[PDB]
Design a protein around this nucleic acid. Structure first.
Length: 118
DNA sequence: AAGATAACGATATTTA
DNA sequence: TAAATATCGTTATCTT
């Protein structure tokens, strides 16, 4: 199977983990025979886990992601370790869709992040 | 549509 | 070295 997960699916995962843990991902074929370990792991870490955060993007967060992108590259795994609860893919999305297109000039000539308007 | 967010596919990095 | 998992660009899928 491919494409977005069903709440039924999300349940098999939560079971597996609760049961075995979030690691021996290949043998999670024992459940959801139609979904790669690869894709299940991903669903957990990025979308199911207790730690994933759900509130909108605080401009604080935006600042952080920005400030490091300037110094570091697109080293998201690293940045996702600096913003508690936000995964690495989440950040990757924040920058490409929002933060990327609101960078700007300053008058001591150093880029500054505009505040979004959505 | 434009504005986000979720998942794919290829590849690199960690681990036992 | 190999099998397991972690990372990242691109893309498929919402959401507004």
């Amino acid at each position: 199977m491919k494409g977005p997960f069903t709440e039924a699916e999300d349940d098999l995962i939560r079971e597996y983990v609760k049961e075995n843990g979030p690691q021996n991902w290949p043998r999670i074929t024992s459940f959801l025979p139609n979904r790669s370990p690869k894709q299940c792991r991903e669903r957990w870490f990025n979308h199911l886990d207790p730690a994933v955060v759900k509130h909108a993007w605080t401009p604080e967060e935006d600042e952080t992601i920005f400030r490091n992108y300037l110094k570091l590259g697109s080293k998201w795994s690293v940045i996702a370790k600096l913003i508690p609860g936000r995964t690495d893919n989440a950040i990757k999305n924040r920058w490409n869709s929002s933060i990327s297109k609101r960078i700007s000039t300053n008058s001591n000539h150093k880029e500054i992040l505009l505040p979004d308007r959505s």
